[model samples]
Target chain A: GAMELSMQGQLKLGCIPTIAPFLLCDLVQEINQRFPQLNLLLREDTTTNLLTALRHGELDVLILALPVEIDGMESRVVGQDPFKMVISRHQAGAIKVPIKYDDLPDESVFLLEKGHCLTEHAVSACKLTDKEKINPFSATSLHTLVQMVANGLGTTFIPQMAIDHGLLDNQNLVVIEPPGQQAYRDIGLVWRPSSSRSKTFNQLAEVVSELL
Target chain B: GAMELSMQGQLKLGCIPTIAPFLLCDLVQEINQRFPQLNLLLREDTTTNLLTALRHGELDVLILALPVEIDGMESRVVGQDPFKMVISRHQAGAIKVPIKYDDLPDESVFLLEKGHCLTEHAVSACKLTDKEKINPFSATSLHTLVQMVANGLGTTFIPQMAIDHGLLDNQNLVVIEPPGQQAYRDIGLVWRPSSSRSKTFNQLAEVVSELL
Candidate 1:
């Protein structure tokens, strides 16, 4: 019988913390609607843990910032999550709009602690100088960074996806587009190359491609 | 010279994830303004880690949910963070408001993962049954839970501090006040019993008490 030809099984998808909140709920619902028979389980963690889980077979696929360095993993780039410099209007009173890389003071930018890939993305993509990389008081989440910036503690970069998802709306802050190459992290889908779920993952990637 | 008579040393403060983002920014700014000579450093982590740090003398004081069971530590109650049941407007259209504990379906409620103290607070304060304790998709942050509930996935309880901070202001959600005793968690300040800075901690607690 050809009745069992559909994508009908469980898939565990792990996402990084920075992207999960703004993306996973809709991703889960859409993936569920598209493949009603497939049971999708979701987990959110740091990039290192997720990658470890993927290698340990605890996770079947991953949705994270891309160009992962693991040997056996393959990725399909879905979209660009561009960065925007966010500052409190109070702090930005003297700063110019469309802030270039140099407009940021070396010591004023705050970011999440060292473990998060978003921190790496921000540091690398934004071309932060050695002194600019210092975090005076490290925060745990982007929400914390936003609040800190809004309180005029400092400035930080946030993903445009989060901003588009209304993360900064109604907050006493301003968003400045930083113009440059590598100014965004590529959002993508990743899976093991030797896995048997290639067809299923490809189809899932197609759905994700549409959503992003 | 009486210059060294002032509270002029560094103090490290550790806060839990659920409360830190909502409380720390303002707390930091206020404390800085109040005691210009005190150098404050902040860290955010889970209750277990923060408690461990506090016991190890790595953190001078903590602001988190109270009634901790750890010995050799002292706490001062600061304020109450009452819980509210939040549900998507679409899912709650048929449900009644002022939702009691019995009104929620066991399988239809979601919460942050177990490591967060907020999970324990919600489970204990809300009087959830054994079967109701299961989390189908565990989220890492309250922000993720908010998005999940707003996507009509399931309902969850959020703190009044977060709600008052405008967490649910524009989301497609309805807030239901659940009336009962133990419906809120006690927010407090915690520190080691033998610390020399009880005066400083007490002064900091007074400021936190006023803010909350």
Candidate 2:
């Protein structure tokens, strides 16, 4: 007998912090309604650790940024997360809208710290190197980074989700779109090749693709 | 050579998630005026990682919650961050103004997931347990939990710093100030006993203690 009941067990899920702001609760409810008996044991960490966990079999699946540089693992591209330049409204006159990547005039960028995948994505997308201008300090959270910009320190990039969900609620700031070529990060689900959950992951990917 | 001149070269400071919101910038400029030549490096992470870094000599100072249960370290109380319960304005009628913990009648509480010190503080301050009320889903950030409560899923607790920074912007939620012995978590600085920089940490504590 072909059984839908076989999926009724525990699955350890991992996610990096960047996408959690947008997807966590919504995805949980969507999958829960479909498979009421499946239990999702959740872990949120930096991408480095989540990948290590997947390699060690500590996690069954992970929601991560795409073009993951690892072997013996599989991935499914679920959606694209674009980046926007956040600046103090006071300096909005300095840069025009939808500037190309090579033409970003100033490098007074306040970067997310080194450990985050979002940091990696930002650096790769902008083609920035250590020699370029960067703020002396690093930011721990998106909220803190926004405040730094509001204080007139430097301009930075913010994901669409944080910008929309009141991350800039009371701050006097503005965001500019990027050129169509370098806009966003690809988001998707990844898991170990040796695990027996490929079919299960594909089903989940179908649901995620619809939303992102 | 009664030399403290080279002490200006480098100092690495780390902090857990809870206190960075209220302290980081002020502490930087707060000390920079007098010691402009001193190099300051900062890192922010969960309490566990900060402690690990401190133990490995990677961090010279840490601003974190008190009750740091570790050997070979010293701490000073610098501030107090009080808690407030948030519920949708739609269901604000259930609890009267600034209610006591003993009077809690419902179990639909949304708790922050483990590893965050704020979650530990909220759990103990409210006297909540697994047998008591909690959401099937635990929130990873205060912003996400705020959304859940606003959507009428459940009520949750938030730190005062987050509230002041517009963590509840555009949301219609009521906040309850606990009326009892337990209302806040102690914020403090802790450092290794053998490290010679208690001189700097002591000076820093004086500025921090005033804000409590």
Candidate 3:
């Protein structure tokens, strides 16, 4: 079983919106070059919908922020994506770096709508549970979220991977390291338990772990 | 009514996904500066849902690409957004500018999912009504669409406003003008007919038309 490592098969992969843009560009190129014979199908949606689609057998694997409450499915930790504090450079008058979570104004923290795992991870990292300050406006995509931040409507945390991919470029904003040991979201792969494609996914995971 | 153009009350506005990120960044700032007292509430969603919400009185007005079929509501043309052909600079070989609509490879033309009005406008502008080259993968955002194009997956049309807002800043892609006299979508304001806030929305539309 260990010797026959021929990775040539179709992969119906689903990914969350927050990670897909930053991850899939490299992932698709790498997959095509390494496993040219493998047919890779990509789908981008919310994590809740992607997990539902995965459990329903519509998707073979997922690349998303992990620690999901998944049953009957297994996941592999591929990488870590640190969260960075995004504030308006023009509107937010400040002189601080690596600010504590408590230092942030509760009402000024803008996040994606409830379904996004990034919101959950950011909220968890910032300890915003008991002191909930839900704003009236909600953004559907990181593009809008960053736009709101740049306009000085509110502050939000964005994945460093996204920022590295030039998500905040040309925008009137500044990025700082959010204070905490776990100020990050784990980027990982998820799949059904003991599927025939286990070795193939594991192989792919090994490739991904190093890429990150 | 025209005598009392008091834009003092709150307005619940809904915008589509494709237009929100590009337009709202400016629109929000303008609204705040112009009508400082008007309590502005925003929601970003699909055209279909926004229309439903507008009819249901959940949304007072909309800022989206136009020619929407509505029974009772009225609309005012605010601006026009031209579509530009986006192709991979590295993968696409020697493509001439201002290429005819007939020259675009149907297989290589990627678009957003079915729900997005940008997809519809692009399909209509390029005369792709009878010939659609639907690929397997679907991108939820323009950020992803441009990424796919940059990665040499396929070509797609993006709005000029979005492009001007640095959507294609660091992408490995080239933008061309698709050939047509009517190669653009009309951006506008939509609202209920004979509503009390007609004068206020029209005032807002005047500001928008000049800005665009």
What number of backbone clashes does candidate 1 have, counting pairs of residues 3 or more apart or in separate chains? 0
Question: Residues B5-99, candidate 2, lDDT per residue (tens digit)?
Answer: 73355677787765665566555444454555555566778898889989999889888887656577888888887888887676688666766
Backbone atom clashes (below 3 Å) for every candidate: 0, 1, 0
- Cand. 3 TM to true fold: 0.82
Real contacts recovered, all predictions? 0.30, 0.12, 0.27
Tens-digit lDDT string for candidate 2 (A72-147) = 7899898887787787676677656665434444456787887766777866775556436676577777656665
lDDT of 1 by residue, B55-145 (tens): 9988899888976666778989988888888887767875677665566566677878878778888878887765563556677678767
> Candidate 2 has which clashing residue pairs, if any?
A82-A184
Error (Å) of candidate 2 at residue A190 is 0.8
Q: What TM-score does the predicted chain A of each candidate obtain versus native chain A?
A: 0.88, 0.84, 0.89
- The complex in candidate 1 yields a DockQ of 0.30
Model 3 stretches with alpha carbons more than 4 Å out: A1-10, A28-40, A94-106, A136-138, A194-200, B1-11, B29-40, B94-106, B136-140, B194-196
Could you give candidate 1's per-residue lDDT for residues A104-189 as a string of tens digits?
A: 56556788888878888877887775665355667677776676666565678899878876677555678887556648988898
How good is the docking of model 2, by CAPRI class?
Answer: incorrect
- Candidate 3 has a DockQ of 0.30
